[PDB]
């Protein structure tokens, strides 16, 4: 459901991401703050199942955002893995991994894990 | 099994954990950084499958360590989830989650994820 995924999504932390789902399974867009100021916009790229099951299952997808743009660099990257569920109350349920660039000594604490639920409202 | 799990294990990061596997699935012991140092010893408790399959599968187990003892407190807790594999090269392969006590605002970055492999040597 490329038509179902394409659009603006909001999470519970105050972040917004606009994405376009290509017919070829590509996901491209921008991840930004609620405000949308230029310094807080980051490129996002991912992939999704462009031919999901028809037994009522969700649509598997994932995307990545490296936290660097033309204004700032947080030397880290986050990947979201989850599935899109359509309907009147459509949502994208995800779990993410945030990895920071670290020295070998700090590699053990380089990755944070969490979960985000995105809605169209 | 019980006899296979009970004993001293070492990870690839310099930590040592001594555990005793009870007949009914209990795991009890100590997790320490350096021997002969009271300030680096912490209590560990967990559970394991005391009647694993006999098809060559590993033995599921998990344990927790709250990073507080009578000398220090890191206000955090780590849980290891994995399986014990017996043999000449016995080991415990795990994935862990380290959660720190945080304010509501920092809850999103409260949990670290990683993996440890423990060996008898």
């Amino acid at each position: 459901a490329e038509a179902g995924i394409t659009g603006t999504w909001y999470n519970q932390l105050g972040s917004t991401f606009i994405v376009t789902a290509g017919a070829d399974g590509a996901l491209t867009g921008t991840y930004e703050s609620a405000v949308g100021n230029a310094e807080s916009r980051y490129v996002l790229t991912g992939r999704y199942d462009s031919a999901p099951a028809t037994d009522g299952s969700g649509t598997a997808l994932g995307w990545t955002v490296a936290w660097k743009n033309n204004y700032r660099n947080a030397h880290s990257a986050t990947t979201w893995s989850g599935q899109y569920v359509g309907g009147a109350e459509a949502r994208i349920n995800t779990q993410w991994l945030l990895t920071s660039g670290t020295t070998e000594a700090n590699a053990w604490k380089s990755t944070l894990v969490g979960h985000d639920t995105f809605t169209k409202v | 099994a019980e006899a296979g799990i009970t004993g001293t294990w070492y990870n690839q990061l310099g930590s040592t954990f001594i555990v005793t596997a009870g007949a009914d699935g209990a795991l009890t012991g100590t997790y320490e950084s350096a021997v002969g140092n009271a300030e680096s010893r912490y209590v560990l408790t967990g559970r394991y499958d005391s009647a694993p399959a006999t098809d060559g599968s590993g033995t599921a187990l998990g344990w927790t360590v709250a990073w507080k003892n009578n000398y220090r407190n890191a206000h955090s807790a780590t849980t290891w989830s994995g399986q014990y594999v017996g043999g000449a090269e016995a080991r415990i392969n795990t994935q862990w989650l380290l959660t720190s006590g945080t304010t509501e605002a920092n809850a999103w970055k409260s949990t670290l994820v990683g993996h440890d492999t423990f060996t008898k040597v």
Binding site: S33, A34, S40, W67, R72 | W108
Partner: peptide
């Protein structure tokens, strides 16, 4: 409060 882009950071800290 938020000092990382992921938690919706608007202004640098």
């Amino acid at each position: 409060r938020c000092c990382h882009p992921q938690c919706g950071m608007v202004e640098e800290c």
